[PDB]
Ligand binder design. Sequence first.
Ligand SMILES: CC1(C)CCCN[C@H]1c1ccc(O)c(C(=O)c2ccc(C(=O)N[C@@H]3CCCNC[C@H]3NC(=O)c3ccncc3)cc2)c1F
Lengths: 20, 337
Amino acid sequence: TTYADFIASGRTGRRNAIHD
Amino acid sequence: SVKEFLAKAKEDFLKKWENPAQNTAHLDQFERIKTLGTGSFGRVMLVKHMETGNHYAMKILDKQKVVKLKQIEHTLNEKRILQAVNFPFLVKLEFSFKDNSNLYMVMEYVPGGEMFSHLRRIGRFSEPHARFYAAQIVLTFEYLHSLDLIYRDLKPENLLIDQQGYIQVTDFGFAKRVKGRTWTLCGTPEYLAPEIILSKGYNKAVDWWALGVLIYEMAAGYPPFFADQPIQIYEKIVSGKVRFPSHFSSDLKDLLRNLLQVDLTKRFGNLKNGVNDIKNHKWFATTDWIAIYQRKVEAPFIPKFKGPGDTSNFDDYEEEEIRVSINEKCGKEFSEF
Ligand SMILES: CC1(C)CCCN[C@H]1c1ccc(O)c(C(=O)c2ccc(C(=O)N[C@@H]3CCCNC[C@H]3NC(=O)c3ccncc3)cc2)c1F
């Protein structure tokens, strides 16, 4: 399930804005 | 009366915008209690104002680190904007000042914690729950954009929940006052509009795309575009194929197809009727916009609060003693702060 794919991802924590 | 409220708010804004408040407090006026968040330049701490006993959130930024990462102008944007605005769902700046090492912004303490924390723990919000939050963002963005302000970092991490269960937007480091177009590649990967990713030159419409991302994330429990590396997220965003969970109502789905619209001539918030295309959409039929503004709507969720200065709605972070150098750092760069 998409939910399961999300929970197993590295993107469920506090997300940082980007820089270059 | 919307147009009227907005003309008055603009007058108020511009006076503070053209003559910013400076140096309205000092570090020794505050007892530092606990870190409520961090970033690469510093941290936000719970503090206590000694002369009133009031609690605040104090953002501390290291001037040399700001300079090293070339965010001087963005930092000046943040403070100048925050001191000038005034809206129920925008965190209120109370004081600002600087010393030899650091910049400081003291704002209202919003004790209910980040939307992000509740959203992850609970899993997802019901449609009425997400709609109640969404309404507040719609109004906030109507206010900000009327002032030529673009926010550019909408996400649950930046939406704090107050004692009454209402939102307060925080972290204006990418907010900018701009007429017409701008080009900075900034934002959070999951929330970037396709036109940012494609180095196009963009406007206030990227905030309306981000609203679509937020609403989706609040209602699904995960964002419409995610992957383990940002480049893969960007590829998903530009392709623009969104799938909706089966539990999304057809009205929600319809709203989101109009917000998550790659085509700027078709994206809601960006058409002839502006924000009214959003406000009058069927997903929002039960929403009383004036009641939201006046905070008279009953919040579907109110966080536990056990005394003033309690931080149980926040994660724990490593603490670090503030050090003030005996030599002034980066005086010229931050003269206006
Ligand atoms: C370093 C870059 C430029 C590039 C990488 C991404 N971050 C960027 C970035 C841009 C501007 C910045 O000021 C910073 C910071 O160093 C910084 C330092 C501290 C904070 C901070 O702690 N903010 C907290 C936690 C992050 C999520 N947003 C909520 C915010 N909390 C609050 O503002 C808050 C207010 C009132 N009551 C309770 C809490 C945010 C940013 C920053 F890290």
